[PDB]
Coordinates of C-alpha atoms and ligand atoms in Angstrom, one line a residue:
Chain A
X42 CA -52.6 -37.3 -42.6
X43 CA -50.0 -39.9 -43.6
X44 CA -52.0 -41.1 -46.6
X45 CA -50.8 -39.4 -49.7
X46 CA -47.9 -38.8 -52.1
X47 CA -44.6 -37.7 -50.5
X48 CA -41.3 -36.7 -51.9
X49 CA -37.9 -36.7 -50.2
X50 CA -34.8 -34.5 -50.6
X51 CA -33.5 -36.8 -53.3
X52 CA -36.7 -36.5 -55.4
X53 CA -37.9 -40.0 -54.6
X54 CA -41.7 -40.6 -54.6
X55 CA -43.4 -42.4 -51.7
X56 CA -47.1 -43.1 -52.2
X57 CA -48.7 -44.6 -49.2
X58 CA -52.1 -45.5 -47.6
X59 CA -52.4 -45.5 -43.8
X60 CA -54.9 -48.1 -42.8
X61 CA -57.1 -47.3 -39.8
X62 CA -55.5 -49.9 -37.5
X63 CA -51.9 -49.3 -38.3
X64 CA -50.9 -50.6 -41.7
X65 CA -48.9 -48.7 -44.2
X66 CA -49.1 -50.0 -47.8
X67 CA -47.8 -48.3 -51.0
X68 CA -45.1 -47.9 -53.5
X69 CA -41.7 -46.3 -53.6
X70 CA -39.8 -44.9 -56.6
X71 CA -36.2 -44.0 -55.8
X72 CA -34.4 -41.2 -57.7
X73 CA -31.0 -42.8 -56.9
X74 CA -29.4 -46.1 -56.7
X75 CA -29.9 -49.5 -58.4
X76 CA -33.6 -48.9 -58.9
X77 CA -36.2 -48.1 -61.6
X78 CA -39.9 -47.5 -61.5
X79 CA -42.0 -48.4 -58.4
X80 CA -41.4 -51.0 -55.7
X81 CA -43.8 -52.4 -53.2
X82 CA -43.6 -51.1 -49.7
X83 CA -45.3 -52.2 -46.5
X84 CA -45.0 -50.9 -42.9
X85 CA -46.7 -49.9 -39.7
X86 CA -47.6 -46.7 -37.9
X87 CA -49.0 -45.8 -34.5
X88 CA -52.7 -45.5 -35.2
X89 CA -53.4 -43.8 -31.8
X90 CA -50.6 -41.3 -31.2
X91 CA -50.1 -39.3 -28.0
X92 CA -52.1 -36.1 -27.7
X93 CA -49.3 -33.9 -26.3
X94 CA -47.7 -32.5 -29.5
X95 CA -45.7 -35.6 -30.3
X96 CA -45.2 -37.0 -33.7
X97 CA -46.6 -40.3 -35.0
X98 CA -44.0 -43.1 -35.0
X99 CA -43.9 -45.2 -38.2
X100 CA -41.6 -47.4 -40.4
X101 CA -41.7 -49.2 -43.7
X102 CA -39.6 -51.5 -45.9
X103 CA -38.8 -51.8 -49.6
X104 CA -37.1 -54.9 -51.0
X105 CA -35.5 -53.6 -54.2
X106 CA -37.0 -56.2 -56.6
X107 CA -39.7 -55.4 -59.1
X108 CA -40.4 -56.5 -62.7
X109 CA -37.5 -54.3 -64.0
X110 CA -34.6 -54.9 -61.7
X111 CA -33.4 -56.7 -58.6
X112 CA -30.7 -55.1 -56.5
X113 CA -30.7 -57.9 -53.9
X114 CA -31.1 -55.3 -51.1
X115 CA -33.7 -53.9 -48.8
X116 CA -34.2 -50.5 -47.1
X117 CA -36.1 -49.8 -43.9
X118 CA -37.1 -46.3 -42.9
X119 CA -37.9 -45.6 -39.3
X120 CA -39.2 -42.2 -38.2
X121 CA -42.2 -40.0 -37.3
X122 CA -44.9 -38.0 -39.0
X123 CA -45.3 -34.5 -37.9
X124 CA -48.6 -32.9 -39.0
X125 CA -49.4 -29.3 -39.5
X126 CA -49.4 -26.8 -42.3
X127 CA -46.4 -28.4 -43.9
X128 CA -46.6 -32.0 -42.9
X129 CA -43.4 -33.9 -42.7
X130 CA -42.1 -37.4 -42.3
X131 CA -38.6 -37.4 -40.8
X132 CA -36.7 -40.7 -41.1
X133 CA -33.5 -42.6 -40.7
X134 CA -32.9 -45.6 -42.9
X135 CA -30.9 -48.8 -43.2
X136 CA -30.1 -50.2 -46.6
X137 CA -28.9 -53.8 -46.3
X138 CA -27.5 -55.6 -49.4
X139 CA -27.2 -59.4 -49.5
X140 CA -23.5 -60.2 -48.9
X141 CA -21.3 -63.2 -48.1
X142 CA -20.6 -63.6 -44.4
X143 CA -17.0 -62.3 -44.9
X144 CA -18.4 -59.1 -46.4
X145 CA -21.2 -58.6 -43.9
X146 CA -19.3 -55.9 -42.2
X147 CA -20.0 -53.7 -45.3
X148 CA -23.5 -54.8 -45.9
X149 CA -25.5 -51.9 -44.4
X150 CA -25.7 -48.2 -45.4
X151 CA -27.3 -45.7 -43.1
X152 CA -28.9 -42.4 -43.9
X153 CA -31.7 -40.0 -43.3
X154 CA -34.6 -38.8 -45.5
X155 CA -37.1 -36.1 -44.9
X156 CA -40.4 -36.2 -46.8
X157 CA -43.0 -33.6 -47.6
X158 CA -46.0 -33.5 -49.9
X159 CA -44.5 -30.8 -52.1
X160 CA -43.7 -32.0 -55.6
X161 CA -40.4 -31.1 -57.1
Chain B
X116 CA -39.4 -68.4 -48.3
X117 CA -39.7 -71.9 -46.7
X118 CA -36.3 -70.7 -45.4
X119 CA -37.5 -67.5 -43.8
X120 CA -40.9 -68.8 -42.7
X121 CA -41.0 -70.0 -39.2
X122 CA -40.3 -69.1 -35.6
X123 CA -37.1 -67.2 -34.6
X124 CA -35.7 -66.0 -31.2
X125 CA -33.0 -63.3 -30.7
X126 CA -30.3 -62.7 -28.1
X127 CA -32.7 -60.8 -25.9
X128 CA -35.2 -63.7 -25.8
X129 CA -37.7 -62.0 -28.1
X130 CA -39.9 -64.1 -30.5
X131 CA -40.4 -63.4 -34.2
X132 CA -43.0 -65.6 -36.0
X133 CA -43.1 -64.9 -39.8
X134 CA -44.5 -66.1 -43.0
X135 CA -42.6 -65.3 -46.3
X136 CA -45.0 -65.0 -49.2
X137 CA -44.2 -65.8 -52.8
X138 CA -44.6 -62.1 -53.7
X139 CA -41.9 -60.9 -51.3
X140 CA -44.2 -60.2 -48.4
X141 CA -43.3 -60.8 -44.7
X142 CA -46.2 -61.1 -42.3
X143 CA -46.3 -62.2 -38.7
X144 CA -46.0 -61.3 -35.0
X145 CA -43.3 -60.1 -32.8
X146 CA -43.0 -60.4 -29.0
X147 CA -40.3 -58.3 -27.3
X148 CA -38.5 -59.5 -24.2
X149 CA -37.6 -55.9 -23.3
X150 CA -39.0 -52.3 -23.4
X151 CA -42.4 -50.9 -23.3
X152 CA -44.0 -53.9 -24.7
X153 CA -46.2 -56.9 -23.8
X154 CA -47.8 -59.7 -25.8
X155 CA -47.6 -59.9 -29.6
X156 CA -47.5 -57.1 -32.1
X157 CA -48.2 -57.2 -35.8
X158 CA -45.2 -57.1 -38.1
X159 CA -45.0 -56.6 -41.8
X160 CA -42.1 -56.4 -44.2
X161 CA -40.5 -57.4 -47.5
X162 CA -37.7 -59.8 -48.6
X163 CA -35.8 -60.4 -51.9
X164 CA -37.9 -63.3 -53.3
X165 CA -35.3 -64.1 -56.0
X166 CA -32.0 -63.7 -54.2
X167 CA -28.5 -64.3 -55.5
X168 CA -27.4 -67.9 -55.6
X169 CA -23.7 -67.1 -55.2
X170 CA -23.4 -67.6 -51.4
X171 CA -24.9 -64.2 -50.4
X172 CA -27.6 -63.7 -47.9
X173 CA -31.2 -62.8 -48.7
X174 CA -32.0 -59.1 -48.0
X175 CA -35.1 -58.4 -45.9
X176 CA -36.6 -55.9 -43.5
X177 CA -39.7 -55.5 -41.4
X178 CA -41.5 -53.1 -39.1
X179 CA -43.3 -53.3 -35.8
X180 CA -45.4 -50.4 -34.5
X181 CA -45.5 -50.9 -30.7
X182 CA -49.3 -50.7 -30.4
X183 CA -51.4 -53.8 -29.9
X184 CA -54.8 -54.2 -28.2
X185 CA -53.0 -54.2 -24.8
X186 CA -50.4 -51.4 -24.8
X187 CA -49.1 -48.5 -26.9
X188 CA -45.5 -47.3 -26.6
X189 CA -45.9 -44.6 -29.3
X190 CA -42.9 -46.0 -31.1
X191 CA -41.9 -48.2 -34.1
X192 CA -38.9 -50.4 -34.8
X193 CA -37.6 -51.4 -38.2
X194 CA -35.1 -54.2 -38.7
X195 CA -32.9 -54.3 -41.9
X196 CA -30.8 -57.3 -42.5
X197 CA -30.2 -60.6 -44.3
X198 CA -31.2 -64.2 -44.0
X199 CA -28.4 -66.7 -44.1
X200 CA -29.9 -70.1 -44.9
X201 CA -28.7 -73.6 -44.2
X202 CA -29.1 -76.0 -41.4
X203 CA -28.3 -73.3 -38.8
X204 CA -30.2 -70.5 -40.3
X205 CA -29.8 -66.9 -39.1
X206 CA -31.2 -63.6 -39.7
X207 CA -28.7 -60.9 -38.9
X208 CA -30.1 -57.4 -38.5
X209 CA -29.6 -53.8 -37.5
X210 CA -32.6 -51.9 -36.2
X211 CA -33.9 -48.4 -35.7
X212 CA -36.4 -47.7 -32.9
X213 CA -38.1 -44.3 -33.3
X214 CA -40.3 -42.9 -30.6
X215 CA -42.9 -40.2 -31.2
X216 CA -41.5 -37.0 -29.7
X217 CA -42.2 -33.3 -29.6
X218 CA -40.2 -31.3 -32.1
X219 CA -37.8 -30.1 -29.4
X220 CA -37.0 -33.7 -28.5
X221 CA -36.7 -35.1 -32.0
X222 CA -32.9 -35.2 -31.8
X223 CA -33.3 -38.0 -29.2
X224 CA -36.1 -39.9 -30.9
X225 CA -34.2 -42.8 -32.4
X226 CA -32.3 -45.7 -30.9
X227 CA -30.0 -48.0 -33.0
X228 CA -29.0 -51.6 -32.3
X229 CA -28.4 -55.0 -33.7
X230 CA -30.3 -58.3 -33.3
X231 CA -29.3 -61.8 -34.4
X232 CA -32.2 -64.3 -34.9
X233 CA -31.9 -68.1 -34.6
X234 CA -34.5 -70.3 -36.3
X235 CA -36.3 -72.8 -34.0
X236 CA -38.6 -75.8 -34.9
Chain C
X10 CA -8.1 -46.1 -17.6
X11 CA -5.8 -49.1 -16.6
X12 CA -9.0 -50.9 -17.6
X13 CA -9.2 -49.5 -21.1
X14 CA -5.5 -49.2 -21.7
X15 CA -4.1 -52.2 -23.6
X16 CA -4.5 -54.3 -26.7
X17 CA -7.8 -55.4 -28.0
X18 CA -9.0 -57.6 -31.0
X19 CA -12.5 -57.6 -32.6
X20 CA -14.5 -60.3 -34.3
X21 CA -13.0 -59.4 -37.7
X22 CA -9.5 -59.9 -36.4
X23 CA -8.7 -56.2 -36.3
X24 CA -6.3 -54.9 -33.6
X25 CA -6.9 -51.8 -31.4
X26 CA -4.0 -50.6 -29.2
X27 CA -5.0 -47.8 -26.9
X28 CA -3.9 -45.7 -24.0
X29 CA -6.5 -44.0 -21.7
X30 CA -5.2 -40.8 -20.2
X31 CA -6.2 -39.3 -16.8
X32 CA -7.9 -36.4 -18.7
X33 CA -10.3 -38.6 -20.7
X34 CA -8.1 -38.9 -23.8
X35 CA -7.8 -42.1 -25.9
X36 CA -4.8 -42.4 -28.1
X37 CA -3.4 -45.3 -30.1
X38 CA -3.4 -47.2 -33.3
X39 CA -5.8 -49.3 -35.2
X40 CA -5.2 -52.1 -37.7
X41 CA -8.1 -53.3 -39.7
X42 CA -8.4 -56.9 -40.9
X43 CA -10.8 -55.8 -43.7
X44 CA -11.4 -53.0 -46.2
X45 CA -9.2 -50.5 -47.9
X46 CA -6.6 -50.6 -45.2
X47 CA -3.1 -51.8 -44.5
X48 CA -0.8 -51.4 -41.5
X49 CA -1.6 -49.2 -38.5
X50 CA -3.6 -46.0 -38.4
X51 CA -3.8 -43.2 -35.8
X52 CA -6.8 -43.2 -33.5
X53 CA -7.9 -40.6 -31.1
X54 CA -11.0 -40.4 -28.9
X55 CA -12.5 -39.7 -25.5
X56 CA -13.9 -41.7 -22.6
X57 CA -15.8 -40.9 -19.3
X58 CA -13.0 -40.7 -16.8
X59 CA -15.3 -40.7 -13.8
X60 CA -17.9 -43.3 -14.8
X61 CA -20.8 -44.6 -12.7
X62 CA -20.0 -47.1 -10.1
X63 CA -23.4 -48.7 -10.2
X64 CA -22.7 -51.6 -12.6
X65 CA -22.9 -49.5 -15.8
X66 CA -20.3 -49.5 -18.6
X67 CA -17.9 -46.7 -19.3
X68 CA -18.9 -44.6 -22.3
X69 CA -16.3 -44.0 -24.9
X70 CA -15.7 -43.3 -28.6
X71 CA -12.8 -42.9 -31.0
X72 CA -12.1 -42.1 -34.7
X73 CA -9.8 -43.4 -37.3
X74 CA -9.2 -41.5 -40.6
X75 CA -8.1 -44.2 -43.0
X76 CA -5.0 -42.4 -44.2
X77 CA -1.5 -43.5 -43.0
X78 CA 1.9 -43.2 -44.6
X79 CA 1.1 -46.2 -46.8
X80 CA -2.5 -45.9 -48.0
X81 CA -5.4 -43.5 -48.2
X82 CA -9.0 -44.8 -48.4
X83 CA -10.6 -41.2 -48.2
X84 CA -12.8 -42.4 -45.4
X85 CA -13.1 -42.3 -41.6
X86 CA -14.8 -44.5 -39.0
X87 CA -16.1 -43.6 -35.6
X88 CA -16.8 -46.2 -32.9
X89 CA -19.3 -45.3 -30.1
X90 CA -19.7 -47.7 -27.2
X91 CA -19.0 -48.7 -23.7
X92 CA -16.2 -50.5 -21.8
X93 CA -17.4 -53.3 -19.5
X94 CA -14.6 -54.1 -17.0
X95 CA -13.8 -57.1 -15.1
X96 CA -11.6 -60.1 -15.7
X97 CA -13.2 -60.6 -19.3
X98 CA -13.2 -57.0 -20.3
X99 CA -15.1 -56.0 -23.4
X100 CA -15.7 -52.9 -25.4
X101 CA -19.0 -53.1 -27.2
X102 CA -19.5 -50.6 -30.0
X103 CA -21.5 -49.4 -33.0
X104 CA -19.7 -47.6 -35.7
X105 CA -20.2 -45.3 -38.7
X106 CA -17.8 -45.4 -41.7
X107 CA -18.1 -42.3 -43.9
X108 CA -16.4 -42.2 -47.3
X109 CA -15.7 -38.9 -49.0
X110 CA -18.2 -38.7 -51.9
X111 CA -19.4 -36.3 -54.5
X112 CA -22.6 -34.5 -53.6
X113 CA -24.7 -36.7 -55.9
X114 CA -23.4 -39.8 -54.1
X115 CA -23.6 -38.5 -50.5
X116 CA -26.7 -40.6 -49.9
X117 CA -24.5 -43.7 -50.0
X118 CA -21.5 -42.3 -48.1
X119 CA -22.0 -44.0 -44.7
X120 CA -21.9 -47.7 -43.6
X121 CA -23.0 -48.8 -40.1
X122 CA -22.0 -51.8 -38.1
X123 CA -21.1 -53.1 -34.7
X124 CA -17.8 -54.5 -33.3
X125 CA -17.1 -56.2 -30.0
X126 CA -13.6 -56.0 -28.7
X127 CA -11.9 -58.4 -26.4
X128 CA -8.9 -57.4 -24.3
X129 CA -5.7 -59.4 -24.7
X130 CA -2.4 -59.5 -22.6
Chain D
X158 CA -11.2 -25.0 -44.5
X159 CA -12.3 -27.3 -41.6
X160 CA -10.7 -25.1 -39.0
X161 CA -13.1 -22.6 -37.5
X162 CA -16.4 -22.2 -35.6
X163 CA -19.3 -24.2 -36.7
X164 CA -23.0 -24.4 -35.7
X165 CA -25.5 -27.2 -36.3
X166 CA -29.3 -27.1 -36.8
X167 CA -29.8 -27.4 -33.0
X168 CA -27.7 -24.3 -32.4
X169 CA -24.7 -26.3 -30.9
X170 CA -21.3 -24.7 -31.3
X171 CA -18.3 -26.8 -32.6
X172 CA -15.0 -25.0 -32.5
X173 CA -12.2 -27.0 -34.1
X174 CA -8.6 -26.9 -35.4
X175 CA -7.6 -29.2 -38.2
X176 CA -3.9 -30.1 -37.8
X177 CA -1.9 -30.5 -41.0
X178 CA -1.5 -34.3 -40.7
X179 CA -5.0 -35.3 -39.8
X180 CA -5.8 -34.3 -36.2
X181 CA -9.1 -32.6 -35.1
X182 CA -8.9 -30.9 -31.8
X183 CA -11.5 -28.5 -30.2
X184 CA -14.5 -28.0 -28.1
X185 CA -18.2 -28.7 -28.4
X186 CA -21.1 -26.9 -26.7
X187 CA -24.4 -28.6 -27.1
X188 CA -27.7 -26.7 -27.2
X189 CA -29.6 -29.8 -26.0
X190 CA -29.3 -32.7 -23.7
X191 CA -27.5 -33.3 -20.3
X192 CA -24.8 -30.8 -21.2
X193 CA -23.6 -27.3 -20.2
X194 CA -20.7 -25.2 -21.4
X195 CA -17.8 -26.6 -23.5
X196 CA -16.6 -30.2 -23.7
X197 CA -13.3 -31.4 -25.1
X198 CA -13.4 -33.1 -28.5
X199 CA -10.8 -34.9 -30.6
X200 CA -11.0 -36.6 -33.9
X201 CA -9.4 -37.2 -37.3
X202 CA -9.9 -36.2 -40.9
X203 CA -8.5 -37.1 -44.3
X204 CA -5.6 -34.6 -44.7
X205 CA -5.2 -35.5 -48.4
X206 CA -8.7 -35.8 -49.9
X207 CA -9.4 -36.9 -53.4
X208 CA -9.2 -34.3 -56.1
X209 CA -12.4 -35.3 -58.0
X210 CA -15.1 -33.2 -56.2
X211 CA -15.4 -35.5 -53.3
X212 CA -15.9 -34.3 -49.7
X213 CA -13.3 -34.8 -46.9
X214 CA -14.0 -37.6 -44.6
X215 CA -13.8 -36.9 -40.9
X216 CA -15.0 -37.9 -37.4
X217 CA -14.8 -36.8 -33.8
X218 CA -15.8 -37.7 -30.3
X219 CA -17.1 -35.9 -27.2
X220 CA -17.3 -37.6 -23.8
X221 CA -19.9 -35.6 -21.9
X222 CA -17.9 -34.9 -18.8
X223 CA -16.5 -31.5 -18.0
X224 CA -16.1 -29.4 -14.8
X225 CA -19.9 -28.7 -14.6
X226 CA -21.6 -32.0 -15.5
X227 CA -21.1 -35.7 -16.3
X228 CA -23.7 -37.4 -18.4
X229 CA -21.8 -40.7 -18.4
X230 CA -22.2 -40.8 -22.2
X231 CA -20.2 -40.1 -25.4
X232 CA -21.1 -39.0 -28.9
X233 CA -19.2 -39.7 -32.1
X234 CA -19.9 -37.8 -35.3
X235 CA -18.9 -39.4 -38.7
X236 CA -19.2 -37.4 -41.9
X237 CA -17.7 -35.3 -44.5
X238 CA -16.7 -31.7 -45.1
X239 CA -17.9 -30.1 -48.3
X240 CA -16.1 -26.9 -49.2
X241 CA -17.3 -24.1 -51.3
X242 CA -19.1 -20.8 -50.8
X243 CA -21.2 -22.1 -48.0
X244 CA -19.0 -24.8 -46.5
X245 CA -20.7 -27.6 -44.7
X246 CA -20.0 -30.6 -42.5
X247 CA -22.7 -33.3 -42.9
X248 CA -22.7 -35.9 -40.2
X249 CA -24.4 -38.9 -38.7
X250 CA -23.8 -39.5 -35.0
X251 CA -24.0 -42.2 -32.3
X252 CA -24.6 -41.2 -28.6
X253 CA -23.8 -44.1 -26.3
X254 CA -24.7 -43.9 -22.6
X255 CA -23.2 -46.2 -20.1
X256 CA -25.7 -48.8 -19.2
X257 CA -26.0 -52.1 -17.5
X258 CA -25.6 -55.2 -19.7
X259 CA -29.3 -55.9 -19.5
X260 CA -30.0 -52.3 -20.8
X261 CA -27.4 -52.2 -23.4
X262 CA -30.1 -52.7 -26.1
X263 CA -31.2 -49.1 -25.4
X264 CA -27.8 -47.6 -24.9
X265 CA -27.3 -45.9 -28.3
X266 CA -29.1 -43.0 -29.9
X267 CA -28.5 -42.2 -33.6
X268 CA -29.0 -39.0 -35.4
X269 CA -27.7 -36.5 -38.0
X270 CA -26.3 -33.0 -37.7
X271 CA -25.4 -30.5 -40.4
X272 CA -22.9 -27.8 -39.6
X273 CA -22.2 -24.5 -41.2
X274 CA -20.1 -21.5 -40.2
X275 CA -23.2 -19.2 -40.0
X276 CA -24.0 -18.0 -36.5
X277 CA -27.5 -18.2 -35.3
Ligands
BTN504 O1 -29.2 -49.3 -54.7 C1 -30.0 -50.1 -54.2 O2 -29.6 -51.1 -53.5 C2 -31.5 -49.9 -54.3 C3 -32.0 -48.4 -54.2 C4 -31.7 -47.8 -52.9 C5 -32.0 -46.3 -52.8 C6 -32.1 -45.7 -51.5 S1 -33.1 -46.2 -50.2 C7 -32.5 -45.0 -49.1 C8 -32.3 -43.7 -50.0 N1 -33.6 -42.9 -50.1 C9 -34.0 -42.9 -51.3 O3 -35.1 -42.3 -51.7 N2 -33.2 -43.6 -52.1 C10 -32.1 -44.2 -51.4
BTN505 O1 -39.8 -49.7 -25.7 C1 -40.5 -49.6 -26.8 O2 -40.6 -48.4 -27.4 C2 -41.1 -50.8 -27.5 C3 -40.3 -52.0 -27.4 C4 -39.0 -51.9 -28.3 C5 -38.1 -53.2 -28.1 C6 -37.0 -53.3 -29.0 S1 -37.1 -53.4 -30.7 C7 -35.4 -53.6 -30.9 C8 -35.0 -54.5 -29.8 N1 -35.1 -55.9 -30.2 C9 -36.0 -56.6 -29.5 O3 -36.3 -57.8 -29.6 N2 -36.5 -55.8 -28.5 C10 -36.0 -54.4 -28.6
BTN506 O1 -12.5 -49.5 -46.4 C1 -12.2 -48.4 -45.8 O2 -12.8 -47.3 -46.2 C2 -11.3 -48.4 -44.6 C3 -11.3 -49.5 -43.7 C4 -12.6 -49.6 -42.9 C5 -12.7 -50.9 -42.1 C6 -13.7 -50.9 -41.0 S1 -14.0 -49.8 -39.8 C7 -15.4 -50.6 -39.1 C8 -15.0 -52.1 -39.3 N1 -14.3 -52.6 -38.1 C9 -13.1 -53.0 -38.4 O3 -12.3 -53.5 -37.6 N2 -12.8 -52.9 -39.7 C10 -14.0 -52.3 -40.4
BTN507 O1 -27.5 -35.9 -23.1 C1 -26.3 -36.3 -23.1 O2 -26.0 -37.5 -22.9 C2 -25.2 -35.4 -23.5 C3 -25.5 -34.4 -24.6 C4 -25.8 -35.0 -25.9 C5 -26.2 -34.0 -27.0 C6 -26.2 -34.5 -28.4 S1 -24.8 -35.1 -29.2 C7 -25.7 -35.4 -30.7 C8 -26.6 -34.2 -30.8 N1 -26.0 -33.0 -31.5 C9 -25.9 -32.0 -30.7 O3 -25.4 -30.9 -31.0 N2 -26.4 -32.2 -29.5 C10 -26.9 -33.6 -29.4

């Protein structure tokens, strides 16, 4: 299932609980960037996916402020969970930093992360 | 926080009602004017609760999974952006809408776009 | 084609000069108002030369590599979007700006945004 | 170098020539979507990359019209070439379909393709 401890290709750790009615709640620890230790995350997932082989849509957010650091930024991940022997969460993400209006054009990074439950 | 909290409408005519908590939480409901959607959907997200004071926006994001007690689109949108405060407050965003797909169709699972929200009263 | 061909300016104040060829080619120059850029840069792209006639936009895209004979930013932007014709013609786009990075920094190589171009005369 | 025949994770074939001063010219054949046979592509790349280990920035466009089909759409790929024993081109892409104004919100797909010169 979605609940568990996940790792992406960068070595970041995503610990999440999927509530029965669609909540995602957990913590995120990034291996890269202006980040240290765990950050709060919240999100949502489709708690009644299609029964045709399709993945389960989901998304979550981290604001990059915790007791250690504040990067004045937030990332959202949007993607789908694909169950099976080697379960996967495939995502695309948007990292927005707070900027002035004149620099808003360069406020948002985009990328893609794939998660599995295999520990580095 | 008082800044973010409130009712907002985007260029499509969608409605965003949000509460910003002291801990960095965003909670509320979203009603989309378009797509496979009807009525209100739960949203949850996070914002920078101690932002820069140097004329920068406040970073934030939130998610809606497009399932409520009336419809299920088997999809989820995330919005990533910044709140720009002041008397004409704005939330400027980019978003990713992922649909659940089969593996063969995963290449076409995700739409991208941008929404600008205006605060109402 | 006559529609796309011309001079266009975006919300940043950047300048796009383009010629649309009968074969679907776009050629021209781009001058950015912002970033690690000065003067004009070559652009090349493609457009749908036989678009739908049913009130839909004309799909198109183009690339600028941010090297000219005056500066090199070691980066490239692609714009993907549609031309909306008529007396107030627009090109509405989303873009991806990739910088060359080391492998360890590749996760932060790409910016995303959106530009709207207005045709001038 | 960039010039050559490349394949992505979907099995699409990208045949390209990198001109000395920054042009990319070639053809693209997609394994998926509303597409058959080869399509014209053009793009640009950094013809004098940094000498610090960094990749070479590049991008290209395909409009999905050829003598067989017209999907009334265009894709742009933005990314970097990474040389070495197993050269790679890592990209993110935007696929815009012509739409009415009211449907423009759903006009643009986003994804990511990785290319190598290894034939399936
Ligand atoms: O530098 C920052 O502003 C905060 C840390 C951002 C790290 C990002 S989020 C997207 C990507 N996936 C990760 O696991 N880490 C980076
Ligand atoms: O069609 C779906 O799968 C569900 C509805 C998605 C509607 C989206 S979310 C991004 C954009 N902004 C809105 O206010 N509505 C659309
Ligand atoms: O800073 C760079 O690496 C080169 C200049 C990039 C400027 C970009 S491209 C997308 C956006 N639209 C513009 O008109 N300018 C910026
Ligand atoms: O369906 C269409 O509108 C035309 C074909 C699009 C296929 C795309 S482009 C991005 C992705 N990478 C590929 O190799 N194929 C798909």
